[PDB]
């Protein structure tokens, strides 16, 4: 039962919680062995693991649709923000072996802090699909959510944002010293400035273009 | 008696043969879940549907999954019908309701087909092209160290708490590589 | 037979719980000393008496040092 929950919160719906791609993890079955109010608890708890499925579906399809190495950097950070949600699910089954009195309320308690991470990062995963972002403007759209309002989503995106800057130090290292561009395709011509984030001013970009063009001569 | 006792006690053998398996447990639903679910189904008037899932204990599932992810064939669990390895739906543990089990064994059978087709390709050179030969040699070189990692994990089962969800995240930096 | 050794296991984990309650109240006992303290209290004795005993015995090894 309390391991049956631990597979519901993972990617195994089973017969008790019937997954649907319009509203998943449903229970409307009657239980002589569970209390009538218990359903209510599970219903609130149902909001958590559902999102963990949906994020997971988003990581499977990616890596004429969307393309880019930018999408190969948001996803990698979404792995690391889910890593403590792996660890704090491995801890529960260790705790359940000896103690038989650990009910559902301790799982609701211990994973209460993922009812603030998940809903504030799901708007970020919905935002890139409702409006398509495939260039270098992903850093602005994530960078306005890292300011956030709440401390978990404030750090969780900064972990993602560092690697998005890191892939931008492979283009701005090959161009400026070795005179190499288009070794990896984007999304004389040397243009990148339109998709560059607006908190990066024009002066540093006009410096970068001249330094890159001087290596060719 | 003398030899049949040494067999019956110390060797597992009940479930991969035609024999009803007896297994004591600590009842009361949290791991008695399959029996409670069957009691609810029969109390709700099915009518009969005499389901016969023989039984297995949990750890034996872990070791057969590891032997399938290795690349060796011929195991009791995981029947296959056209060359693609799929779940055997003849089994129950004491829990997992036969639906969570049917999903998780399907997910690892998906990687089982990945390793099975590539070992079939590796077998079709072992019984003359000289670049295909180098390619399959590269895959063989990856595979031998991979099988070393799972084989050392299997030795730690004979001796920590291990379940299915632990070994899949343990093989995560390699099952991503196998795809 | 079998339960008589798992019962004393069920003594050990309670004996570990009191090892937390001892250190969060800053007591001079260690784990070996507390075992003797449970053997004292099962037979029945005022713990104010034992506490006065240890409150003198602890001051009779650092008053000579």
């Amino acid at each position: 039962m309390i391991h049956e929950l631990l597979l519901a919160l993972s990617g195994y719906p089973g017969s008790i919680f019937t997954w649907n791609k319009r509203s998943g993890l449903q229970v409307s079955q009657d239980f002589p062995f569970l209390h009538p109010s218990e359903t209510s608890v599970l219903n609130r708890l149902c909001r958590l693991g559902t999102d963990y499925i949906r994020f997971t579906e988003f990581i499977e399809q990616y890596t004429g649709g969307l393309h880019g190495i930018y999408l190969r950097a948001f996803c990698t950070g979404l792995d690391s923000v889910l890593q403590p949600y792996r660890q704090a699910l491995l801890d529960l089954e260790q705790e359940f072996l000896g103690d038989p009195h650990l009910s559902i309320s301790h799982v609701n308690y211990f994973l209460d802090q993922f009812q603030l991470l998940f809903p504030s990062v799901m708007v970020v995963v919905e935002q890139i699909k409702s409006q398509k972002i495939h260039g270098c403007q992903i850093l602005e759209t994530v960078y306005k959510h890292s300011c956030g309002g709440l401390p978990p989503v404030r750090s969780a995106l900064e972990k993602i944002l560092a690697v998005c800057h890191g892939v931008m130090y492979k283009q701005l290292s090959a161009w400026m010293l070795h005179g190499l561009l288009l070794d990896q395709h984007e999304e004389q011509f040397s243009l990148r400035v339109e998709i560059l984030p607006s908190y990066i001013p024009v002066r540093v970009a006009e410096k970068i273009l001249f330094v890159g063009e001087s290596v060719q001569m | 008696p003398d030899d049949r006792s040494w067999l019956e006690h110390h060797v597992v053998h009940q479930y991969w043969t035609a024999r009803p398996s007896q297994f004591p447990h600590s009842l009361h639903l949290h791991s008695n879940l399959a029996a409670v679910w069957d009691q609810h189904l029969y109390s709700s008037d099915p009518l009969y549907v005499p389901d016969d899932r023989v039984l297995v204990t949990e750890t034996q599932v872990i070791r057969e999954t590891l032997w399938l992810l290795s690349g060796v064939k011929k195991l009791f669990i995981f029947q296959l019908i056209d060359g693609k390895v799929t779940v055997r739906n003849n089994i129950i543990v004491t829990h997992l309701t036969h639906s969570c089990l049917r999903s998780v064994l399907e997910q690892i059978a998906a990687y089982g087909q990945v390793v099975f087709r590539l070992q079939e390709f590796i077998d079709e050179v072992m019984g003359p092209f000289r670049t295909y030969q180098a390619f399959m040699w590269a895959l063989y070189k990856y595979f031998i160290s991979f099988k070393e990692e799972l084989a050392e994990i299997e030795k730690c089962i004979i001796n920590t708490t291990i379940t299915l969800a632990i070994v899949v995240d343990k093989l995560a930096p390699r099952l991503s590589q196998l795809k | 037979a079998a339960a008589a050794a798992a019962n004393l296991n069920a003594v050990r984990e309670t004996m570990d719980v009191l090892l937390e309650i001892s250190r969060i109240l800053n007591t001079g006992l260690d784990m070996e000393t507390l075992s003797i303290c449970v053997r004292l209290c099962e037979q029945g004795i005022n713990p104010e008496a034992l506490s006065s005993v240890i409150k003198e015995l602890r001051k009779a090894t650092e008053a000579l040092k």
Partner: peptide, 23 residues
């Protein structure tokens, strides 16, 4: 005596098909 004997190492084999006291 019993509590001098208490100090042996705990078991590392846990059962999930036995949730109440699996040594």
């Amino acid at each position: 005596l019993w509590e001098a004997a208490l100090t042996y190492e705990a078991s590392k084999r846990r059962c999930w098909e036995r949730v109440g006291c699996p040594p």
